[PDB]
Amino acid sequence: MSLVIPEKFQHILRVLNTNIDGRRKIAFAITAIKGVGRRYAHVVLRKADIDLTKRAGELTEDEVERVITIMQNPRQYKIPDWFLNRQKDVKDGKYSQVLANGLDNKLREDLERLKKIRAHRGLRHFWGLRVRGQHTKTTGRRGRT
Amino acid sequence: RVQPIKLARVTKVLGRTGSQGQCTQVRVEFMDDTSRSIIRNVKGPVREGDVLTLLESEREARRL
Amino acid sequence: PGVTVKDVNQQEFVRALAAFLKKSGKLKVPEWVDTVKLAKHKELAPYDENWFYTRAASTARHLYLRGGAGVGSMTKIYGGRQRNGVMPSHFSRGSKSVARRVLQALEGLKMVEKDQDGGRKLTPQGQRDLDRIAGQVAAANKK
Amino acid sequence: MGRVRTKTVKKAARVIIEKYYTRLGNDFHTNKRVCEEIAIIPSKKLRNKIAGYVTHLMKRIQRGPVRG
Amino acid sequence: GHQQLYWSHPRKFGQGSRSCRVCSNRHGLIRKYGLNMCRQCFRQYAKDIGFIKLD
Amino acid sequence: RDKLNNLVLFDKATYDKLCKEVPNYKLITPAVVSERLKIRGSLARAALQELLSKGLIKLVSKHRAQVIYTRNTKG
Amino acid sequence: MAVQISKKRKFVADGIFKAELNEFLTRELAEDGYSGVEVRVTPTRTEIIILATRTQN
Amino acid sequence: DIKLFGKWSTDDVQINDISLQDYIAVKEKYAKYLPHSAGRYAAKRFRKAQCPIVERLTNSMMMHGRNNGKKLMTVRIVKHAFEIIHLLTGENPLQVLVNAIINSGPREDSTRIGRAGTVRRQAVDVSPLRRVNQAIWLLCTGAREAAFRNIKTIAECLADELINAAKGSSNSYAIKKKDELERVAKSNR
Amino acid sequence: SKGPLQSVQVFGRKKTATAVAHCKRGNGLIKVNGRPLEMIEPRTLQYKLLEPVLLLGKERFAGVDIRVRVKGGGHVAQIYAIRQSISKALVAYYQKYVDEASKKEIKDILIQYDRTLLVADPRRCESKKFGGPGARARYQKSYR
RNA sequence: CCGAUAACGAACGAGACUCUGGCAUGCUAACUAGUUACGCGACCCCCGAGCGGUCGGCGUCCCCCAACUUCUUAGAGGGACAAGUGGCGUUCAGCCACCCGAGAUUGAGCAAUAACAGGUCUGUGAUGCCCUUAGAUGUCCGGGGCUGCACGCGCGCUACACUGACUGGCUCAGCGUGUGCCUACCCUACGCCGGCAGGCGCGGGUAACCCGUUGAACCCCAUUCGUGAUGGGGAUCGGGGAUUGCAAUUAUUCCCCAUGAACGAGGAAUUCCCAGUAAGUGCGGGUCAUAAGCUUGCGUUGAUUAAGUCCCUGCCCUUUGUACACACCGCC
Ligand SMILES: [Mg+2]
Ligand SMILES: [Mg+2]
Ligand SMILES: [Mg+2]
């Protein structure tokens, strides 16, 4: 009841292969995982069915292992297929949500496959320019100098 | 050595001064000694009949 | 005293009605309540997990205040400013599906019905219970 | 500031005072009433400006001769 | 010249579909109230239509 | 003016001091109590409402942008 | 009326017709002392009267 | 009797200096139930004096773009500030506000055109209208610059700026700028 | 105690926000748009709406029955139009059905408190010109 | 304008004028605007209210079955003139202040004599002269380009945060558009399906009849966040879905999930502005198969400072100099 810090608390704690804060709210603290935003964190925690007002160190270890399974395998846990990151993948055609350095692997893969096929988007990516059709006469000068 | 602060009552406004009109010449007599009337240069919109604080008595207002 | 909903504070009245609909289990909810966004201009899910009962409570007094309010009327009512990112803000309407689900749920609850023209209106039992809860919440508010 | 009259209203007031003096008066409403009928002013604005100047000159002439 | 490609380009919309009803220019065309008029032309004929700068 | 690093929750040293010293000074507000005890501020609001439900203070304003509490009147 | 058009477009169309008519009559009777033209439109018929210097011409 | 914000009678107040006595509108006829009345007090000269002072407080409070049209927010701000100062002092919030205004008002300033070629800063006195304007402006901007980057709220900082100005505690923003202005007035009097 | 047809209808408007009060004989009660003034939406201005009745007290409001309908404008304009509608309707009903020798001592309180309670504010808006964002603000310019 | 006064009497521009806005419980009238009262209800009420209350529920032009215009609409008019009074002034033009008054300077349009070798031949079947005219600088179709980036300048939007952000709830606008001669392109309520962007079926509106009682934003009320480049910011970038079109890649637009960059109030410099004004804040029109970060209009919330000056920056007038008169881009 708005009590002191319990003994079973972690102020910095490890999830997958990266650490997340403890003082933050439980949903906002886990968005630091590279690939999950506020909406995904909130929906997977609502499916985790726990107290949302408690911080990240008040999450007991069984709740840790509970939330990570949901966040890793959303499609079995009634998460809508339109909610996911890798909808209709170009490799397997199977929806998934990519997290941490897995997302880094996927993005690097997209860049290098576009580079291999020598598409205009891939060439713009390699040259570091803009890829979404916007102008380049006046902007980007911070990144260029 | 420091002169005591007192008040002066505006009798009438003489004109605008300060090379930009920012100041306003006024004729004021102290209610403490109603015989003595001096010109002072004020800062801000001042009407006739209002009073204002004066930190000194000897000092008068020159042009500008 | 004959107390009508127009005689009571709406901030308290809405939560009173939502509490009543929470008490009565006849009202139905869709399974996607905890997942979907309430509008195009919303940036986050609603904080309350009873937001559906809140929505029904709001639209109940809205249809009481004026009838003929269809799904589009509900979405215009519940619409809000869209931040548009870097573009200047604008107005966007609410979700059509959430208005459809709430109005159809009230219709199944059978205190609202389709009119001789478009839109829906309260049954007399609807305002009967609305003024009942308004009277009891007014008594609790005053004393 | 900016309430000065014009020569068009001033001269017409002078002429009507000099020609029809006896009928005029010291009431503005009366002055505009007589002016409305004995003079042809297309506009109400010009009409009552003429009447006001006529009244002011009436106040002047009742206590001192003027250029009129 | 050949019948098929002399007009094969669709111009059922866009700026090429419409033109000024006075000078056939497609720039600054005013389509309000079905005017369909080049602006420098409408400023010329404004009095005739009945448009008056009341203010 | 380099870092705050406030306590998100209480401990042994802070909870007892809050309980013993809060009902003495005139101004009982979430921001002021956060300044005094280096607490987070969500915790300050929660602790203020828990102390109000304990009865060691009385509510004053209760506005959605800022609440005011005050020490008990002595009599 | 779905076949009929808005009153705004009606007045716009009539003004456009008057302008085109006046321009064409100018370019047609410039040497004939063209001065002006007017139209009285009634549902029965329209009467167009042309003011010129030499109506014999 | 007037009960601005439902309390804090304005009949028990007083002004120590006649110069601001006729230029403060906290009196019974210029006492309003709320600090919100657009009576067109800027239409001609010297009408902001007839404007009630607590209206002026929110008037000078709403500044700096993000809140430039909001009067209701500044009204609830002055409401909460009055509540806070009365809780932590016990005397009349309006009376202590008047005392804060009087303490903060800079009696002298400079003209900056004391000579034509070079800046000279001839020291001159201040009309009472400029006095009240400078005082309220300094207080409002003092609260603004007190609570821009902290947990401390605008109502709290307006309250304690008024308290510090009333007591002349030398740490208030308005008091400090007044002190600096008097210092430069003596510097180039 | 049974005189019928004792009714007036007095409007009050400011900034394209009109509010008409229908005043008639009845029990002392108040309602704007079918809800009491105490249950108004911007309650931070609720003292402005209860201000006219607290001026002369409920004693002269005990024998009156008034209902107001409001349309147009925004919230603050609605508030000001409502209060001036209330004051004007009360003073007009009073002057109509009883003597003005006692209407003076209620009109003078209103005028000495705030002229807007009986005289509407004429200022509405100014036109935006094609040189800048608004009525008098102009667009930027650069010489270099 | 007054006043001196070899000038008097005029004329144009200014003013005047037209429109705009506030005031008329005065007039003219309104089932394409309504308001009261009445009769049906519907519900709250019975402690008892009972001529109790709410209804943008239904009617009293469903025509015999009520009135009126207060609200709205727009015509005729009126109304404000420094009119009254105190003071200043040559006591003149006028100025300041105050009462009564809705209003004691509302905004605009038009704008002289002239000049700028100012801009436009790319607005024109306006136009002299010249260039080209069949391997066309005519014209049509296809593709690209008009977007392209070491850097520099201008107009803008977005923020930098707790005076805030998020969630929900309460909640009030006015300008104004809306189905097409070419020309195939309208505005849209309601019901259903989708989470969204969208799709389907039924209508209404060529318009004070429908969209629409324009349920807007901002703001207001509660919760959560907590000084952390943080739940501020959403730049960049990935994956996926719909819309328009013949065609979307150089991403047309919009939607969902993803990364979260700079940015912590801005050096020298410099813009705009006096009352419903700056500003914040949305909404219409123009653009349009698709569309606004632009612009033109409207509405909401709504201030600070000043009633002055020639210090700066420009402009005019008088005097003056001139060897200039093609008029200093001069002459020599
Ligand atoms: Mg003129
Ligand atoms: Mg993203
Ligand atoms: Mg010589």
A55–F12 CB contact, under 8 Å: no
Residue A68: which domain range?
Answer: 12-77
Q: What share of chain C is helix, strand, coil (3-state, %, to 5)?
A: 55, 10, 35
Q: Which of I60, I70, I84, I76 is nearest to I34 (CA)?
A: I70
- How far apart are alpha carbons D64 and D7 in whole angstroms? 22
Q: Smallest CA–CA separation between I133 and chain C, in Å?
A: 15
Structure tokens belonging to residue H121: 């800063």
Structural domain D2-62, CATH architecture: Orthogonal Bundle (1.10)
Domains, chain G: 7-57 (3.30.300.20)
- Tell me which DSSP letter residue I138 carries: -
Domains, chain F: 1-75 (1.10.10.10)
- How far apart are alpha carbons H108 and B54 in whole angstroms? 9
Residue C26: which domain range?
Answer: 1-143
**For chain C, which chains pass the contact test of at least 3 CB pairs under 8 Å?**
A, I
- How far apart are alpha carbons H36 and H24 in whole angstroms? 17
- Tell me which DSSP letter residue H6 carries: G
- How far apart are alpha carbons E28 and E38 in whole angstroms? 6
Query: C-alpha H172: how far from its chain's center?
Result: 13
Structure tokens belonging to residue F34: 């956060």
- How far apart are alpha carbons H78 and H159 in whole angstroms? 9
Matching residue, tokens 């059905």? I97
Provide the number of structural domains found in chain C.
1
Structure tokens belonging to residue I68: 């107001």
What are the distances in angstroms from CA I13 to CA I96, I118, I122? 21, 11, 9
- How far apart are alpha carbons A42 and D5 in whole angstroms? 76
Chains E and F touch (3+ CB pairs under 8 A): no
B50–H127 CB contact, under 8 Å: yes
CA of E1 to C1' of J139 (A): 9
- How far apart are alpha carbons F75 and A7 in whole angstroms? 41
- Taking phi first (over 0 means left), then psi (-120 to 50 degrees means alpha), and beta for anything else, what does residue B18 get? left
**H, E, C per residue of chain A:** CCCECCCCCCCEEEECCEEEECCCEHHHHHCCCCCCCHHHHHHHHHHHCCCCCCEHHHCCHHHHHHHHHHHHCCHHHCCCHHHCCCCCCCCCCCCCCCCHHHHHHHHHHHHHHHHHHCCHHHHHHHCCCCCCCCCCCCCCHHHHC
Matching residue, tokens 């302008």? G19
Cβ atoms of G32 and E53 closer than 8 Å: no
Which residue's CA shows the smallest distance to C1' of J244? E13
Chain J positions with an atom below 7 A of a protein C-beta are 1-3, 10, 14-23, 25, 35-37, 42-45, 47, 49-57, 70-72, 78-84, 92-98, 100, 102-103, 105-110, 123-126, 140-142, 147-164, 166-174, 177-185, 188-199, 206-208, 212-213, 215-228, 231, 233-241, 245-246, 249-260, 262, 264, 271-283, 285-290, 292-311
Extract long-range pairs of H77-83: CB within 8 Å, 24+ residues apart.
H77/H154, H77/H155, H77/H158, H78/H35, H78/H54, H78/H158, H79/H5, H79/I44, H80/F61, H80/F63, H80/F65, H80/F66, H80/F68, H80/H155, H80/H159, H81/H155, H81/H158, H81/H159, H81/H162, H82/H5, H82/H8, H83/F60, H83/F61, H83/F68
User: Would you tell me which CATH number, out of the four given (3.40.50.10880, 4.10.830.10, 1.10.10.10, 2.170.120.20), belongs to the domain E1-55?
Assistant: 4.10.830.10
Helix (H, G, I), strand (E, B) or coil at I137: coil
Residue A43: Cβ within 10 Å count:
22
Chain A residues within an 8 Å CB radius of C42: none
Fill in the amino acid letter for H149: R
Residue I75: which domain range?
Answer: 1-144
B54–H125 CB contact, under 8 Å: yes
Give the residue from chain A lying closest to C35, CA to CA: A43
Breaks (C-N over 2.5 A) in chain D follow: none
Cβ atoms of H20 and H132 closer than 8 Å: yes
Length of chain G: 57
Cβ atoms of H46 and H129 closer than 8 Å: yes
Sign of the Cα torsion B50, B54, B58, B59 reads negative
b/e map of E33-51 (b: 16 or more CB within 10 Å)?
bebbbbeebbeebeebbee
Contacts of residue A48, defined as CB under 8 A and 6 or more positions apart, other chains included, come to A63, A66, A67, A70
Sign of the Cα torsion A30, A32, A34, A39 reads positive
Which residue's CA shows the smallest distance to C1' of J20? E55
Matching residue, tokens 């609807």? C126
Chain A residues whose C-beta is within 8 A of a chain F C-beta are 1-5, 22-23, 55
Contacts of residue C18, defined as CB under 8 A and 6 or more positions apart, other chains included, come to C50, C53, C54, C56, C57
Give the residue from chain G lying closest to E48, CA to CA: G19
Q: What is the A112 CA–ligand 2 centroid distance (Å)? A: 20
- Which uninterrupted H or E stretch holds H123? strand H123-125
Cβ atoms of E49 and G16 closer than 8 Å: yes
- Which uninterrupted H or E stretch holds G46? strand G46-52
- How far apart are alpha carbons E45 and G15 in whole angstroms? 9
H76–I116 CB contact, under 8 Å: no
- How far apart are alpha carbons C61 and C69 in whole angstroms? 11
b/e map of C6-22 (b: 16 or more CB within 10 Å)?
bbbbbeebbebbbebbe
- How far apart are alpha carbons A83 and A104 in whole angstroms? 19
CA of A138 to C1' of J151 (A): 9
Provide the number of structural domains found in chain I.
1
- How far apart are alpha carbons H136 and H35 in whole angstroms? 15
Angle, helices H128-146 vs H173-187, to 10°: value is 130
H76–F63 CB contact, under 8 Å: yes
| Sequence ranges of the domains in chain D | 2-62
- Provide the experimental method for this PDB entry: cryo-EM
Sign of the Cα torsion F56, F58, F61, F62 reads positive
Q: Which of H24, H125, H127 to mutate to test the interface with B (most CBs of B within 10 A)?
A: H125
F61–H80 CB contact, under 8 Å: yes
Q: Which of H48, H23, H172, H19 is nearest to H100 (CA)?
A: H172
Q: What is the A98 CA–ligand 2 centroid distance (Å)? A: 13
Cβ atoms of C18 and C69 closer than 8 Å: no
Residue A28: Cβ within 10 Å count:
15
Cβ atoms of I69 and I75 closer than 8 Å: no
Chains D and F touch (3+ CB pairs under 8 A): no
- Which uninterrupted H or E stretch holds C71? helix C71-77
- Ligand number with the minimum distance to the CA of A107: 2
| Sequence ranges of the domains in chain E | 1-55
Cβ atoms of H124 and B23 closer than 8 Å: yes
- How far apart are alpha carbons C74 and C93 in whole angstroms? 9
Annotated binding-site residues of E for Zn(2+) read 20, 23, 38, 41
Matching residue, tokens 């005072």? D17
